[model samples]
Target: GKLPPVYPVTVPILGHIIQFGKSPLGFMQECKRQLKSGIFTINIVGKRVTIVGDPHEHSRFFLPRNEVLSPREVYSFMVPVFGEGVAYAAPYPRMREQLNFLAEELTIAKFQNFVPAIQHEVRKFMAANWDKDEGEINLLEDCSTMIINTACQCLFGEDLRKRLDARRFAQLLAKMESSLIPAAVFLPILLKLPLPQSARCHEARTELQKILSEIIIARKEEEVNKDSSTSDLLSGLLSAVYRDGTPMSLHEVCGMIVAAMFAGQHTSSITTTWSMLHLMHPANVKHLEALRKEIEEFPAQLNYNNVMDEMPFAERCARESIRRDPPLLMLMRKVMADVKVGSYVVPKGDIIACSPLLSHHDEEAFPEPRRWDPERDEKVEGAFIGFGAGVHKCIGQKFGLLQVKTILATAFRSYDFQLLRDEVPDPDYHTMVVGPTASQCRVKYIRR
Candidate 1:
């Protein structure tokens, strides 16, 4: 039985998990370089974590259907924290239904003039936080604040937002993410040990559902008014019925709620801020100038269509930022059948991963892996996987990109940004998508 080459295991029982943790990107590179191949297996605890580092063979990971390579097994940890009967835990058909509802709702067409939502929030935050004519602030947090408020305004109705404001939603979302244990992905048996009882995730998930129940109950009375139905994502989800004609459980709806709200929050903020960080640095002035060239003629108020049609360079800047440092570094799936990837056979039952961070930086595909050249094109096709590809490609990217492009346009117009540090901040290596390290990203903005 032929197989991809394996990294010699020094730790045996612990294997490369500890070594990989200290610096996964570098470790992945060393394996690719040392082994002299694009595909290789490294053990995580006892499981075989085979990474598809080959940019050309990335299609091998993403092209297969869920039956052959199931993603839920990798994120299986989400079962207890998010909800029991939804998303990854649900069966394939029902899961498809659940995924479909979410995908359809976030379809950019569904947003009723969401650009205004993004524009208003970006300006409002600058008015409050960047109040002085020129000042230094944590660029990451301000970007996060804008993303949180902007997304909620686009998706939630007046009543839903009032009860669970975006600020309050932030704490709840952060709590759930804290409980995501990468180590337990193998120590799954350890989850039942009572040590990780999920009291906080339980508390937050319950708090969200209870609040939704109040909104649904209040709306039942308001339904008599006839004009209020389907006014927001909550009602939009409430109106959807599975193929069996059963309405979605409130817990299931809560899972969708968090998925839509939570998925883009960090990544979009990081993408927006990372692109801005690059544009502000002296070396990258040309890329920034091109972005300005693209949008310089647009009016102060950026409508959805304005960014939708003309923000090509701004989009490139955002894409290039993500290309340099993708937030979701690894996209993984459990192999159900042995699949051939570029002459190598990946055996069944192994955890196969595709790293956007690794592939986007391929020397052959991108001549200079370290430089943030927004104008560059991939020499190897499909090399850029910042938002993934094929079957499970991200549906929310357009919304997030729009959210970022609008911020780029509005923020750059009103002020000139200076990176307080001499060099652009290196990625913090944290987004689960990496943004510039927060402490290193102190920036000053001079109001124009």
Candidate 2:
């Protein structure tokens, strides 16, 4: 098979790093067009970064077993946040066990009260902050706050919430998040060197661990007599026994907790913020009306089925928002062995990437890609990969979607929103999790 076409590396030492740093999606799009092929290679610090920009061939990148397309090397920078022995740092077997354990905790079987809990938190949040008849808010900031609060209420126990509220937890998590160099995915050298941010990350992780240890011990003492149910997600992890009969360690549990909540909060909030922003714009007024019609007849307090089953249009709103501006720009794997994409062969030691940011913009797959249409369907099969695809697809997707849907139903039921600007805010791509530009996220809210 032919090797994927390569973009000329003018800056050989830095490769395409300069263009990538400025605009990742832009650079990748340029490469795809100039090479006239969706499968192409660009260099980053002498490393080969092959992007599978073709929507139809996404399967080749996401479906390969871990051995063939290893994620550990690409995700080594996560150790500070996910813990030394947790997640991708472990052997693939253990990583599978860890991810499966967390996935089990988030499945629909344990989601009985999630929708109601999420609705309550969102309502409580709006009441406190948007108390006036008409008010202004940074939509992105507010959605983030609600997402964190809702996740904690649904997942953390009373004791856990008492000790660590959403604000405190966010502050600590932000410290750990500060240590991340997403660029480390391609540049192995950064992972080899010790960075100054690691100490603060370690400090924050230790603090969260201390708090979790207290919670676990207290729960143990209290549950000595009673049979516990899956009332809280933390307890679900605490009691989860591995396939080999080993229980998760405190560090592992903390890592999963941070990983689950952190990832969920960032991506979910961005989706929610973008959904609201799109629906608020004048051009999307018809879509907003359709959303309002979908939820107006429901009770102020919602049940799981309301969002899960009945709110199809609302779900699409969130989904289309994700399609337009996916929070995760690129899903990547470090190829351990040769992998085939179309007629090209991606050799071992290459950085294999599938970018939702670029694929969503495919002219054929998504017509008028810039236009936010909740009713729009993908013209190509498997072209819409907002959450992800295959094995590494987001496990928290159900919860994340539920959170967004519930917030959408609740907020639009009793209020109307107006984007302060004429057009929707442009996506801010500088962060690890892309979102709408914070400075441009201001909006006016009117109580019904």
Candidate 3:
């Protein structure tokens, strides 16, 4: 079988590392340009990875059996952050059990129930962060903090919320994010060493687990009379059991909580910031007013069902923002068996990679891809892989989008904001969760 053409490179051991490290999005686009095909390969620090950019061919990665292509191997490094024997470390069936629990918990009914809490949190966050008069704030930082708070309140209940201080939590996440590369590449060694980043990452995870463990124990004591109105994720997890009727252990519950926080909070925050940046840009000022009017004229109460029904324009804005700047630039998988992808056979033991950034910007898929035009219909199918695809697609996606809607609706209705400049920020790709560069993410707001 013929292998996909390797991305042309000049470097020896560090082939494509410099190009990728300098600009991942550009490097990917260059690969697409050279190959003129969906499949190609690039070497990074001696590791050969096959890149698959076609959305139709995404199923080659997304829909394959776990035995053939394992996300666990690709994401094993996350064990340090999410804890041992959970998520990537656990067996596929066990992981699915947890995912199933989460899917059930984030149903439309539950999301509708969560709307009031999300609205309350957004209102409080705005009041606390924004001054009555015009003031500037880092949009990325502000959104990240606000979403994390909201996620904690809605997922873990008030106990964990009280334990998390916005500033301190952000610092901890920074430490954890900083350690991702070293942890992924040299995890075994890093785990043994006393490195500050590694230590801080461990410290953060331990603190989170400690708080969650306490909550789990207390909740267990009150399990008999669990409040019918309690819609938090923790309560759902507590009630969930494996096929054999065994309850989720304390460790598993905590791990799931950590995973949800990491996955949902980071992406939701980044998407919200980027969505607002695009909408509030001088280029889209007219569209911004249009969106604000849409929000203003929303007929029903601002609950999940009503808000989703009333805000098609806002939804498109969020979807377009995600398409343009997805939180995880690349999705990775480890090939367990030889796999065929569009005339190219990817060998076992090699990594398979796909990028939302690549496909989202494909001219064939999205005309004028760089423009932030919410009115334009994203006509191409399978091109937008923002929250991922297939069975492992983000179960909390609706919940995340609902949170974004709540923030956008509340913010637009209450205040008017302008970007510090006309240009949107370049993405800061160093962190695990890709977002706008901090210095370039400022926006000023005035009460409406």
Backbone clash count for every predicted candidate, in the order shown: 3, 0, 0
For model 2, residues 255-321, the per-residue Cα lDDT tens digits are 9998897679899999999999998888888998898888878887788778888989988898899
Q: How accurate is candidate 3 locally (lDDT)?
A: 0.78
Say which prediction, candidate 1 or candidate 2, comes out ahead on lDDT: 2
Assess each prediction's global lDDT (C-alpha) against the native: 0.85, 0.89, 0.78
The collision pairs in model 2 are: none
> Each model's RMSD to truth, in Å?
1.5, 1.5, 2.7
Candidate 2: where are CA atoms >4 Å away?
Answer: 224-230
Per-residue lDDT of model 1, residues 358-395, tens digit only: 89878999888889998899999999999998878887
Consecutive 10-residue window with the lowest summed lDDT within model 1: 190-199
Candidate 2 local lDDT, residue 350: 91
Error of 3 at 386 (Å): 0.9
Q: Estimate candidate 2's alpha-carbon lDDT, on a 0 to 1 scale.
A: 0.89
lDDT by residue (tens digit), candidate 3, 316-351: 888888887788888888889999999899999888
In order of lDDT, best first, we have 2, 1, 3
lDDT of 2 at 423: 90
lDDT of 3 at 321: 86
In model 3, the runs with Cα more than 4 Å from the true position are 164-175, 182-199, 217-231, 299-301
Every model's TM-score: 0.96, 0.97, 0.91
